[PDB]
């Protein structure tokens, strides 16, 4: 018979496979252990493995992924006895930011493709026309919803990664932490019409794994 | 007195901070209370801030910083017993933390970012599929694991092809991809009266539950 009745332990998603990560059966804190099919939780016993049965270390046999499946009911038996190990996953920093509006392509987790949209009339101010109004309005979240603690979490970063007209660093400047768009310069439609950029938004932590966007500006009399 | 003159450890780049990474002090392989502490290693000044001895007398070594193996994929990580000295390396294993790149991948100066690309393709109206297959795209429609050296090779994911999107809206009718090879077919004679040209975006993607996609756009003009 086992100490506790039940058990519980967290796992980050990303850990590797082959990491131990349950060893709570050690120490008079539980023979031979093995792990049970569970028919209420049928991947439990692929995902995670006890390969020295007399220890009943758990070791992670699957990748884990916390967009698909965040808890684990884990049938651990003893030579007769069985137990319930409880396991979390707990959300890591395996994604990147998206932009909003993100409509899902149908069957896929995909967001249907977005370009921002902004107008500008020739021959006026950057101090007449700014902050240049975008539409929707620009903006991204990472989509790890779940990051603990909170201090873990990214900041995002936004740019413009590539343009048409080449030019176009001439006429905008796109804050990095806002996405304020500004004009630099009054624009002339006698030589610009309209520019069409490609806007980037990355995780501020090493890890980018950017996003991207469309920013299509409209030049008007 | 340390029992080796050195040591060797690696590490998974996705391993989280606080995971516990080498153990070899542990079972009297270290040194002969007895008090294991990391130095400052001026040859690899980061190696102190990436790895820390938090119970003084085990020695067990717990990675403090998250790795990157774009940045950095060995440490020279100096422990001294309390007095010497002894050099644990440390090499960084290339895990799955990216996805495909569309090629060919131009950088975008001052970036890690590939230029954006759209593959053109050019198909005569009223030609069958027969005399067309496979229809011809320039350059040609690639990509390839971000993750350059995974190991082993049956760890690497197979790469995923489709039309996630495009315009106008019956382009399915006309257009197929393979999901595994990414040639493009046509499926039925295109009439210049009722379609004069595609926009789609293409993805590739990872097959291992972990898909995250690349995007191009492929535009598709058809002629006389
Ligand atoms: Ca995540
Ligand atoms: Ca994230
Ligand atoms: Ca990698
Ligand atoms: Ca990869």
Known sequence: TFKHESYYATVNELTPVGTTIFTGFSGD???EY???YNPDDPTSNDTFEIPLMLTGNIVLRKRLNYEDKTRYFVIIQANTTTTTLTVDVLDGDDLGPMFLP???VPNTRDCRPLTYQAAIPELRTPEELNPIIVTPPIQAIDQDRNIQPPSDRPGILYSILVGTPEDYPRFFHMHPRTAELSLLEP????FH????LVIKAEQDNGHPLPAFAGLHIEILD
Not at 193 to 196: E, L, N, S
């Open 193 to 196: 019409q309209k520019f069409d």
């Open 102 to 104: 993100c409509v899902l």
């Open 34 to 36: 093995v792990i049970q």
């Open 187 to 190: 624009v002339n439609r006698d």
């Open 29 to 31: 804190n539980g023979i």
